[PDB]
Design a protein around this ligand. Structure first.
Ligand SMILES: [Cu+2]
Length: 128
């Protein structure tokens, strides 16, 4: 529970947290994403994507065009540090990543890249 967090995403297009803090001693960290509700992934699907705050607009605009089978992220996009797949209600997915990819000086963010969700579904990730 030091190096893992669970974030829920809902039928009301929200994540249940706005800020995730990763302790510096973790070597790898896991984010587990759940989706309470009843709506299918092509109506209200959600993923969790991590990048520098500066790259977030570019990933989201390109991802919307990639389609649901590419999890609304451009294939092999080098700006994405880590991501889950798009999940619908009653499903779940995790992603584990190397904490030393998060370097000193830069500001990081998480968001959902499903079309239209980023206005409400985003926040900050800080290593502490
Ligand atoms: Cu979403």
């Amino acid at each position: 529970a030091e190096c893992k967090v669970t974030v829920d995403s809902t039928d009301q297009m929200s994540f249940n947290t706005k800020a995730i803090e990763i302790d510096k001693s973790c070597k790898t960290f896991t984010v587990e994403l759940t989706h309470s509700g009843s709506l299918p992934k092509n109506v209200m699907g959600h993923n969790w994507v991590l990048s520098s705050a500066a790259d977030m607009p570019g990933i989201a605009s390109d991802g919307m065009a990639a389609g649901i089978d590419k999890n609304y992220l451009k294939e092999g996009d080098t700006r994405v540090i880590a991501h889950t797949k798009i999940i619908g209600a009653g499903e779940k997915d995790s992603v584990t990543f190397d904490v030393s990819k998060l370097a000193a000086g830069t500001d990081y963010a998480f968001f959902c890249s499903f079309p239209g969700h980023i206005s409400m579904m985003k926040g900050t990730v800080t290593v502490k």
